[PDB]
Amino acid sequence: SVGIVYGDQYRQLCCSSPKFGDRYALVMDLINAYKLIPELSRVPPLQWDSPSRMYEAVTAFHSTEYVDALKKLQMLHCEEKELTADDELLMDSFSLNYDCPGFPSVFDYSLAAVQGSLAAASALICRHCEVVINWGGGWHHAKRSEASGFCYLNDIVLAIHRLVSSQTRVLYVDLDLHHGDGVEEAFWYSPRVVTFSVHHASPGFFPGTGTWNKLPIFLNGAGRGRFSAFNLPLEEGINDLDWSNAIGPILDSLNIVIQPSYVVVQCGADCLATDPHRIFRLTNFYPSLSGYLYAIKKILSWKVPTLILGGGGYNFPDTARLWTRVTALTIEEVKGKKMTISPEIPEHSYFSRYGPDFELDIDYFPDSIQKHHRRILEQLRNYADLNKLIYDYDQVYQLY
Ligand SMILES: O=C(NO)c1cn(-c2ccccc2)nn1
Ligand SMILES: [K+]
Ligand SMILES: [K+]
Ligand SMILES: [Zn+2]
């Protein structure tokens, strides 16, 4: 079946942050308004038997002292008093400041995404679901002991760790506008988790990595993980077709050579033309075919158990518009069952958020890459050689 993570408490927690507001409620209620929920298997978020078990799960990646600080941050923000100078310094040492501030539910909010993505990994491992979707997860920037880009706990890394520890190889595909630095870093030394991020990069643009680092070079992993971290940085303004042609052959080549046991896709919605970032010009169109839907369709065609996660996306109605279509496409491709979606937003609780036109399409009128393809193809060959993987070089070369 196709699973999707939700629950009443889960929804409350995912809607408790100052930055993402009620975005999760709009996403799930649009999916419900299009009558998709009966097609989906609800996957409940993971809960634990004790504080000690919870800490064991989260500190599989994060440090105990970072988790301690994040829990303390929530406790401090549940009291009226200002933080002490010592406590401010403590939070600063974990980057729990500026773009990752405290708020009264910051620990429960961050933990909830972990609970959802770990439950999603488990549903794939026991084969209850072929694909599981978690639109409350996808927080790819968080590091072992550092919050980053309103990511506090890295649910993706923890989900992948549960998958790889279930010859298991995971392919991670990061479609967010931003480089997936936290996930890349976590698996920098691991050949069994191959990471691939497509993103914008330019001087001063967050987080700064995923690009050229004497002709400067692309770093791509270290130790036994050399050549196992893949990146495609793209110039601003790219449209659905050029983004699809840029990543399409890379995705197919990675699947052929790696033969992954699981695929984990981060589907951050900030590449939409209507995102306030206004960097890329992707759409959610489904006849100009949405780059997101193109990539998800291709990944799902491999018939590999797959985890689909959220991420960025600061236009909340248009994020719901895109992820609703991703969800319908996943049902269609997995179950072989057509999903008809009206071009008009159905009546429901959040209908007013989709004005003034109330349509499902977002409101938008639509050399360098060749060199990246040759570089990435050589890195894939180097990865295959280093890791004793066999494949016909010319079936792969033909893809490009
Ligand atoms: O959407 C994102 N990444 O997925 C993001 C964007 N943020 C950002 C932080 C500082 C400056 C500019 C942008 N932090 N995270
Ligand atoms: K990305
Ligand atoms: K890796
Ligand atoms: Zn982003």
Residue numbers in the entry: 2 to 167, 177 to 223, 229 to 302, 315 to 393, 402 to 435
Text taken from the publication that reported this structure:
In eukaryotes, HDACs, which belong to the epigenetic machinery of the cells, catalyze the deacetylation of ϵ‐amino groups of lysine residues in histone tails, leading in consequence to a more compact chromatin structure, which usually results in an inhibition of transcription. In contrast to hsHDAC8, showing in humans the lowest level of expression of the class I enzymes, in S. mansoni smHDAC8 is the most abundantly expressed class I HDAC at all life‐cycle stages and was validated as drug target for schistosome‐specific inhibitors. The active sites of the enzymes consist of a long narrow tunnel, accommodating the incoming acetylated lysine side chain of the substrate, which leads to a cavity containing the catalytic Zn2+‐ion. The active site residues of the two enzymes are highly conserved, with only M274 in hsHDAC8, being substituted by H292 in smHDAC8.6 The replacement of this hydrophobic residue by a polar one modifies the physicochemical properties of the active site, which could be exploited for the development of smHDAC8‐specific inhibitors.
In this study, initial screening revealed the triazole‐based hydroxamate 2 b (N‐hydroxy‐1‐phenyl‐1H‐1,2,3‐triazole‐4‐carboxamide) exhibiting potent inhibitory activity toward the novel antiparasitic target Schistosoma mansoni histone deacetylase 8 (smHDAC8) and promising selectivity over the major human HDACs. Due to the promising biological activity of the 1‐phenyl substituted triazole derivative 2 b, the compound was crystallized in complex with smHDAC8. The structure reveals that compound 2 b binds in the smHDAC8 active site in a straight conformation, its capping group pointing toward the solvent, whereas its hydroxamate moiety forms a bidentate interaction with the catalytic zinc ion as well as hydrogen bonds with the side chains of histidines H141 and H142 and the hydroxyl group of catalytic tyrosine Y341. Interestingly, the triazole ring of 2 b is observed almost stacked between the side chains of phenylalanines F151 and F216 that form the active site tunnel normally accommodating the aliphatic part of the incoming acetylated lysine side chain. Yet, the F151 side chain is observed in two conformations, one turned toward the active site, participating to the tunnel mentioned previously, and one turned away from the active site. This suggests that the stacking of the triazole ring between the two phenylalanines observed in the structure is not absolutely essential for the interaction. In addition, the nitrogen atoms of the triazole ring are not facing the smHDAC8‐specific H292 side chain but turned toward the Cα carbon atom of glycine G150. Finally, the capping group of 2 b does not appear to make extensive interactions with smHDAC8. Yet, the rather small size of the inhibitor allows it to fit nicely into the smHDAC8 active site pocket. Replacement of smHDAC8 H292 by the somewhat bulkier human methionine M274 could potentially explain the increased IC50 for 2 b measured with the human enzyme.
